[PDB]
Amino acid sequence: TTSAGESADPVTTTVENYGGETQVQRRHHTDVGFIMDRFVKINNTNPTHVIDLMQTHQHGLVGALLRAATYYFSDLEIVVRHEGNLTWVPNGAPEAALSNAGNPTAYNKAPFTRLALPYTAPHRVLATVYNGTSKYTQLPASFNFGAIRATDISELLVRMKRAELYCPRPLLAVEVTAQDRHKQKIIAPAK
Amino acid sequence: TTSAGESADPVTTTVENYGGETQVQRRHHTDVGFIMDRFVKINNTNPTHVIDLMQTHQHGLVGALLRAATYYFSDLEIVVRHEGNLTWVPNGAPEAALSNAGNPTAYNKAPFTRLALPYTAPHRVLATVYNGTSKYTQLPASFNFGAIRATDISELLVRMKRAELYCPRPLLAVEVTAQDRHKQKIIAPAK
Amino acid sequence: DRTLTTRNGHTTSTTQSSVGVTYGYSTGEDHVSGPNTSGLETRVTQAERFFKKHLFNWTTDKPFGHLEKLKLPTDHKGVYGHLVDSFAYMRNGWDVEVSAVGNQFNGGCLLVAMVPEWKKFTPREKYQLTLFPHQFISPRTNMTAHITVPYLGVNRYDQYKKHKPWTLVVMVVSPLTTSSIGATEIKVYANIAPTHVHVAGELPSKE
Amino acid sequence: GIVPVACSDGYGGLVTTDPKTADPVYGKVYNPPRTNYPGRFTNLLDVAEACPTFLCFDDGKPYVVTREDEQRLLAKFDVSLAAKHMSNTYLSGIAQYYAQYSGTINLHFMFTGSTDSKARYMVAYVPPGVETPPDTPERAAHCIHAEWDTGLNSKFTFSIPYVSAADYAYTASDVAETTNVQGWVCIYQITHGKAQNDTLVVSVSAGKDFELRLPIDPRTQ
C-alpha cells in the first residue's frame, strides 16, 4: 500500500497485501459505555464533598480514560461509607442547603449507602479541559454532579452510567527508562 | 402589549412581540402533588404527639409551601424513631385511648417505624389559617391527623400523599439587607 | 488535479500545491437555533471572510517538538472585531489554511492541527498530537494545509471575551534540512475564515 | 425448596425522597365529599403566571416617581430571582426553593397619574458583558428596548427574554463576584409633561415558558 501521507486521510492496510487473511474480531471490551461503567474510588473525601468526576486518579482505568476525552456526559452512581445521615444537593444549591433534611437524605444502613444520581448540570455536555476563565488550572464551578455531606465520609466510589465521550485527547502509558521493553511481574502459579 | 391595568385581568405577553420565539417548557418539578411529596422533620416531639402538619418549620420546602395555601387535603406517611411500642389514635379519640393496645400499635423494629395513615379529620378540607374561634393565634382542635404515643419519640418525619391545595396565600423570600442582590456560597469543586 | 480554490464571502484563495481539505469532527454545523437564545439570534454574513496572520519562522535550529499556537479568535480589526465587541454572545466554525513556502529542494515536516480547549502539552503527549484534525506540510509534496472545523463547546453560544475554544497549532515533526539550492528559512503564514457567524444579545454602545 | 434471595448491601436505607410507599395499618376510611371545591391550583407556576406581584424599590415602595432632572434613569435592577428589588415578589418566593430556571419574565408597568399629566417611558434589557450599565437612553437605546406613552390604556407588559449561554441558569448569585451573570434591566423616563409627583407602579410575573427545575431548601432553621 502506498499513499500521500500529507493528506492525513486514514489508511488501514490489511494482511491480504501479502497472502494473509483477516480474521474475525470482537471488540466488546473496548466499548465506551461498557469500559466506563465500573466503580472507582475518590481520594478527596471530607465532611463535605462536591462530586466532580475529575477528582478520580489520573492513572486509574475510568479516570485516565475520562481524561482522554474532551467532552463527556453520564448519569452517576455513588457508594458512600459514612457515619450519620447523608445529604445530597443538586448542581447549584447553596452550601447551607446541605444542612437540612428536605433534600435527599439517606439514613445510614449497616454496610454503606448506595445511591443513583441523575445528571444535573446546566451545560449540555461537561468538559475535562476548559480554555479560559469564568469569573468577571481549574474548570468552572458549574462542572459537577452536586454535593454530599455527612458527619465524616470514609470512602466514596463513583460509577458513570450511560457514558458518552466526545473529542479524544492524548492518552499516555508508563515510560520505559532504559530497558528494551517494560518488564514487570505477571501472576504465576505458586511453587 | 397595552391594556387597562385596573381591570385586573391576566396579561401574559410573550417574546413574539419583538421578533423572538417562545420555547417549549416542562414544569414537572413545580407540580403540587409532586413537590409536596417528600419527608420533612417535625421539631415538636414529646412522649405524646398530635400529628398536626402546621408544626413543620415555616421555612422548609414542604412547610413553607403548605403555609402558602389556605385549604389543603392529603393522606399521610410517618417515620418515627422510638423506644417501646408506638400507639396511634385517629382524629377525635380521647387521650386515654393512647394507652391501650387495641389501637394501631407498632412493635419496634431495629431502625425505626414507618407507617401510612389515612386522612381522618371530619372536615372536608383542612385549613392553615382560621378566622375566628371554635369555643363557646391557634387553629381549632379538630385540624389534625391523629395522635401518636411512645415511651420517648426521638425523631418524627411526615410526608403528604395525594396533596391537594386551594386558595393561595403570600409566600415570602429572605430579604436582602443592603446588597444589590443576595450573595451566598454555591457548591464548587474543591482545590 | 491539485489546484484548489477556496472562496469565502468576497475573498478567494487559490493554491496549486494542495493535498485536499480535512474536515475535523464533522462536515457541518449542528442546530444553530436553540432553546437558550430564545430565537433572538441573527446571522452576520459580512464577517465570513479571510484574515491573515503570522505564526513563526521555521528555521533550521528548531528541533522536534517546537509548538507554535494561535488561540482563536484573535485580536481582529475587521467586522469580526466589531461583532465581538458589540454582541454579547457569538458562535462560528473555522476554516483555516496554513502556508509555508520554501521550495522542493528542502526537507522536513510540519504537523498542522486544530486543538479544542487548549492545554499545555507535556514533552511526551506531543507524540500523539495526531489525534486532532490535522494535516502535514512537507516541502517535498505540498505547501498548504487546509482544515475546517465546526463550532463545538459546552455552551451553544459562547463569550469570546472569556472562552476561546479552538487553537491552531503547528509542530515541527522533522526539522528543516536545507541544501545549496533550498530556502534558508521558511515563514509560516496563516489564513483563517469564520463560517456561520451567528450572534445574539446586542450590547449598549460606548459612544 | 423455597425461593432463594440475596439480601444486597447498600440498598434499602430510608431516602427521604424515595419513590416507594409504606405499609398501611388502618383501612376502609371514606372522606367527606369535596367535589368542585372553588379555588384549586395544581401548579405553582400557573399561580405565578396569573397573579402579578409588586417589586420593592427604594424605601420599600412599589412605584417609581417621575423625577425633575437631566438624569432620566428611573431604576435599574439585576435579572436574578435573588435581586434586591424582587425580594418580596411571589415569583422569587417560589424560586428560592429551586436550583435552576429558564424562560421569559414579564414586567407590568401601570401608570397612576392624573388625567392632566403625561409621560413617555422606555425599558431596555442590557445583557452581560458591559462594565458600567448605561446611564442615559441615547446610549442604552442600542439594546433590546421598548417605549410607551400614557393614555387610555395605562398598562404595559415587557417580556424580559432569556438570552444566555447555558440552557439553564442559577437562581442565586454565587459569591462576592460582581457583575451578575445575567444582565441588568434599566427603566428610563424619556420625558414627562406636568407630572411632578405622579408615580409608576411596577410588578413582575412569570412568562409563557418559565420553568424551575431542581427542588432544594436553603432557608436556615
Next chain:
Amino acid sequence: GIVPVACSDGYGGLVTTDPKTADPVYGKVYNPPRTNYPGRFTNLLDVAEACPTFLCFDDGKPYVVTREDEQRLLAKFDVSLAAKHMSNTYLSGIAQYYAQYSGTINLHFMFTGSTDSKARYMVAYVPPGVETPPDTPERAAHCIHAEWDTGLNSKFTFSIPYVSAADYAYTASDVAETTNVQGWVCIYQITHGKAQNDTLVVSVSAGKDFELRLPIDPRTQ
C-alpha cells in the same frame, strides 16, 4: 401466609463491577439537548484505527535518519505493546489497561526528504525462535518482508501480522526473561542516493482486526 425466602450466604456483597443497578432518589430530570454533537466516538479501537501516532526512537525522535555506513539496520523493536519504542503511542496507551490482545498492527512510514534525494527501504518481521536478530538484509530477506521506493506517494503501510501459538497474547513482558515471546521487527535501509540528513517518520496504529480482551488497571497510584 406470606412468601417464604431463604437469605443465602455469600451473596449480595458489593462487587465493584457488578452488573446490577442501584435505587433512585431523585426523579423527573430532563437534560439539555445534544443532538448531533460533533466528534463522538463509541469504541476506543476505532479511534486507534483512524489516527496513527508516532513512535519514540533514540533521543525521543519519531524519525530515523539515513545513515552513511556499511551497516544498514536503521532500527529494531520488539512486537510488544509495552516496547520502549511504543511507550508514547496512543495504541499502547490503551493496551496498558487490558490483559490480552490479538490481531494485526499497522506501521506507517512517511518519507520527509527533499525532491533531489532518493532511498529504498525494507521492513521485515522476524518471528521468535532465532537467538540473535539479523543485522543485514541479505540475511533477514527470508522472513516476511516488504520493500519500497521513494517517489510521488511518500507513505507506505505494513501490516505486522499476528502469528503465534496461543490465539491471544499478553500485553506485558513477563519477567527478567529475555527474547520476547513475539518476534522483533527490523527496519533496514537498502540504499540511498544523495540523502545525507533527510529522515523517515514512523507511526503505528491498529489493524482491521485488532482486539483487546480483559480490562485491568496496573498503574500504581
Next chain:
Amino acid sequence: SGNTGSIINNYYMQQYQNSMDTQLNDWFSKLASSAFSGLFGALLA
C-alpha cells in the same frame, strides 16, 4: 400519581393503602390559560 416510581401495582388494595374519596375542577389553570396575549390596537410591523 405524583412522586411514585414503582412499575408493579401496589401490593395492598386501594381501600387499605389510602382513604377513598366520595362524590355528590382546576381553577387557576383556567385563569392562567385564558390570559390575554398578543397586542392591542393597530400594528405597523
Next chain:
Amino acid sequence: SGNTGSIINNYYMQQYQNSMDTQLNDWFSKLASSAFSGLFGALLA
C-alpha cells in the same frame, strides 16, 4: 445498555432510574470505516 445483566425490566420507571434526554451520530466510526485499503497503482501478483 452497556454493563447491565438483569433479565427482568428495572423495577422503577425510566423517569426515576435515570435522567431523560430531550431532542430538537457516531463520527469516528464513520472516519475509521471509510479508511482507504487495498493497494495503489498497478499490481503484478
